Structure formats: structure tokens, C-alpha cells
Design a protein around this ligand. Sequence first.
Ligand SMILES: [Cl-]
Ligand SMILES: [Cl-]
Ligand SMILES: [Cl-]
Ligand SMILES: [Cl-]
Ligand code: NA
Length: 574
Amino acid sequence: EITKKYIKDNIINVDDNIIKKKDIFKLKNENNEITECAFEYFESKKKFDDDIESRFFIINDNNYNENINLIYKDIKYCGLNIQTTGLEVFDENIRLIQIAVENYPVIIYDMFNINKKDILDGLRKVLENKNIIKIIQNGKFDAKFLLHNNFKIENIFDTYIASKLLDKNKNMYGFKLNNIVEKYLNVILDKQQQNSVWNNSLLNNNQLFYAARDSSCLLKLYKKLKEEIKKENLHIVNDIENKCILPICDMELNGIKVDLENLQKSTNEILNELNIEKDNLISLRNYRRLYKLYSAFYLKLPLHINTKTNKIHTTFNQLKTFSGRFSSEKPNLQQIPRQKNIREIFIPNDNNIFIIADFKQIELKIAAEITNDEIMLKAYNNNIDLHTLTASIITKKNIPDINKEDRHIAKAINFGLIYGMNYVNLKNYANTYYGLNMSLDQCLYFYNSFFEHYKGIYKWHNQVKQKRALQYSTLSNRKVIFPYFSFTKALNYPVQGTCADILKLALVDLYDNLKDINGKIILCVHDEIIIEVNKKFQEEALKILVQSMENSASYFLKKVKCEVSVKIAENWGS
Ligand SMILES: [Cl-]
Ligand SMILES: [Cl-]
Ligand SMILES: [Cl-]
Ligand SMILES: [Cl-]
Ligand code: NA
């Protein structure tokens, strides 16, 4: 009776708390004359104890009023959300699309009851329009869905990113829509409706008020978060991370293909090697090595292979690391052995080839930039290697008299001392990881000599030891707050954090430059980016990738020049 009162709009009345109203809304047609059009919208009887827009339009085949698309005129921003039937974008569907516009009830597109393309025309224009901001909670999740369903979208403000950056890695939890709204608005949403059934072709009135309020609330969060971002000078990083959403969606939708031939083959190889070692039993070495490399990889990897496409679609995390670097899970691309024997199982698609680029010594160059160390900066500008430079200082030799053994000792000194080791730790570090046999009298000479010449590094280290601060920033002003002071983590953070800024910005510029040649971004790990392109744009994509990374480094570094090592390859092991 009341339960089916609005079945023509595909709505179930679960508690008699929904009325259909019809009123005259003032609009402007493209001819700049005010067309007052009457619209049917829904509203609750029991009013909500807050100020969020809880009314909503619903769009379907039987009530579509084309004049609805006139609310989208001369708008600069709008809240955007979707409701899905599940988490996996390949196995699920978009149930709803909600667009909240300032002062108007939310426009809800009933996707399960729309079969005319002309209805979604006004929608696609808003999504594509680079001049309208779309405010989103979890933009990766929602953009990933829209992209996979042939929706184009540009210009995004993720409230999750703003909230995560404002927290400065002080918390792991508290970044769901419900928590954010309770903190910045003191409103509690009916989160119970997450577990409701979105698969049916009917929705109840409670599901639709949640869909409206969880989209309009974005309009108020944007105003508060936009402001806090500015008061914390986080606009540069927040802008880079928002633009980096689309590249990351690219990397997850594209996935990376696997060559099941060499996978099965190599699997049998390691299996037989394990059997042989078991019979002979060298013991610990070959047995533990082959056992771990077998079970912790050759057996787990097949589980993530898409059965139909032979592709792996990892999950890239944008803001879940301390430094700000990317991380991945299911699978964890940095847990794959860095060996050519194993990495050659990942191949491009048919008629395509990989282009792989890395930075040489970006971390050490960043340290020289932020410390204004003159000897290091002058040496890099003369294209003198930093390990040769340190070898020159330690041995007092001229570059023509420096042998490979000198540069090896210099590598240990540089990586050990720049990041805050003392001479006693340097000895253990050197003998352990480099195979040297230095004495404490030598390492104390290295320590005193290193900081006697690298006066920028010494001033850097000394001031950090003195202030014992808990707040640190990067060159993008990505901020973090330590629970307690740690010398080595304070030195490492600005360096590693700045790498994250440079790589992420490189993916933004790269994602734009690759449209001409329909290039695909595949993966970013450590200091390395991988793209896939058709072989005819091989030589052209090489230049784009290098130029993108170099332009990014140029954005942040003014006194030192990065160096990109690029190579075309058919497999990841090359
Ligand atoms: Cl959420
Ligand atoms: Cl600041
Ligand atoms: Cl911003
Ligand atoms: Cl570099
Ligand atoms: Na969302």
C-alpha cells in the first residue's frame, strides 16, 4: 500500500518516511533567460537534525526531464559519489551516480533503470569538464569504476587525500567517510546502508537518503578541507596527489601481463632443484633459498593471475607509507625478486613493448640540494660521481689515480655517513654489507674527513641533533609528525619524501603526454617507472618518459640535475 507507493520510480517505502513533492526551480537556459521548470523530487517527512541536503531527484527512463541538465550550468564544483554492488570493479556494476550541486537537491542517476544514452549526456559533460571540480571520497575507487564503464573524468578533489595529508601520518584509521564527516561536520551518516542490498532493481527510501547525504556532505567538506590545506601550506602536495589519481587508476586497470610458459617452466625448474637439494642433503643456502623462492612466489603468484587475461592487477596505495612513496599489495610488487631469471615472466601485450626508466642517485642529489652542500653541488654540476668525489677526499688522490677499490670504500662511507651513522656503526656496516675489513682508526678518519669537507651535511646533521624536532617536511611541503625523535628517521624522511613527490609528479606529467600515442602506465616501484606502448611509437615514448621525469625533478630541484637511465625492453628482467 504505502510500501509500493512510488514503484514507478523504483522506490520501496520502508517506514512511511518519504514524500514526493513537485516545485518550481529557477534555472537559466543557454540563452541566458531564466527558465522556471517544475521538477519532481523526494524528501523525508521526519526532518534530519542537521543542515545537509537530504532531498534528491531520481533519474530513470520513465521520468527523465531533459531540463534537469540545466542545474549543471555555470557551476565550478560539485559533489560526486557512486554506489556499487561490490568492491571489485571487474566483477561488479555501478548502481547509482549521485551529483550534488550547491543549493539543489542531489541528482541521483538510477543506473539499473536507465537505458537511454541521451539521459547521461549532461552527466558526461560535467565529468569531462576540466573546469568543474568533482569532490570525491576515495577518488581512486570511484574513478576506477567510472573509467571502466566508459566515463571520462578530469579535475578531482579527494577528501580522503586532504584528510590523510592533514593527519601527517599520526593515525592509521579514521579516514572513512563516516569518520571524516563526524570530525569536520559533527554529523553521523547511516553507515548501516553499506551492507544493504544494492543489487536489486529497487531501492528503499533509507538507501536513497544515505546516497543523497553521502554526496551532498562533500560540498561542506570541500570548503573546510580546502581551507585547512591552505593554512598548512599543503596546496602543492594536495594538488599533486589529486592529479595522481588518474595515473594510478591507469596502472591498476591496465595491470601487467604474465608469460605462463616461463612461469610453469621455471616452476618445474625450481621444484626439481628443490628435490635434488633434498636428496643430496649448501644445505641452508640452496634449500632455504629455493624453498622460499618456490612457496613465497612461484606458488602464490598464480593466485593473482586473471584467469581470462593472464594479467595481474595490483593495488597501489597512495598515502599508506610513512615517506609517501607508493606501496602495493595483492601482490606486493616490491616483494618480487629483483632477478632477471624471475622478473622476465612479466611481459607486455601483443604488439607492445615496455619502456623502463630509473633515476641514478636521486636520493643523494636531494640531500645535496636541501643541505646546500657546495662541494657536492659543484661536483654534480661538473658531472663528477659522488663516490669518486668521496674517494678523492678520503685518499687525497686525483681522479686519474682512483681505482675501483677506492670507489667501493667511498660507497660505504657515503651511504653510511649521509644517513647518520657514527664511525663505530660504519665499521660494521662496511664489513657486513660491502665485504670490507676496516678498523676503527680508519672509520674515525673517514668520519672526521667526510664531515670536514661536506660542511652542508654536517650543518644538516648537527641542527637536527639539536632541535630534536618531531615535524618534518619535504620539498612539496608534505608534512609528517613523529611519535618520538629518531635521528636517522629525521634525516631519511625529507630525502625519501621528496622522491615520492618527484615520482608522483612524473606520473601526472607522463599521463598527459601519453595521450597522443595512447600509452599505458604500468607500474612504479622504488625509483622506477614502467610504461607500455605500441612498438611503432617506441622511439617516441622513450623521450616522453625521460622528459616527464626530468621535468618533475626540475620542478623541485634547482641546484642539481637528475639523471634518467632508460632502456627499451620486452620483459621486466632486462
Ligand atoms: Cl569511506
Ligand atoms: Cl609550513
Ligand atoms: Cl588544494
Ligand atoms: Cl638522479
Ligand atoms: Na565515494
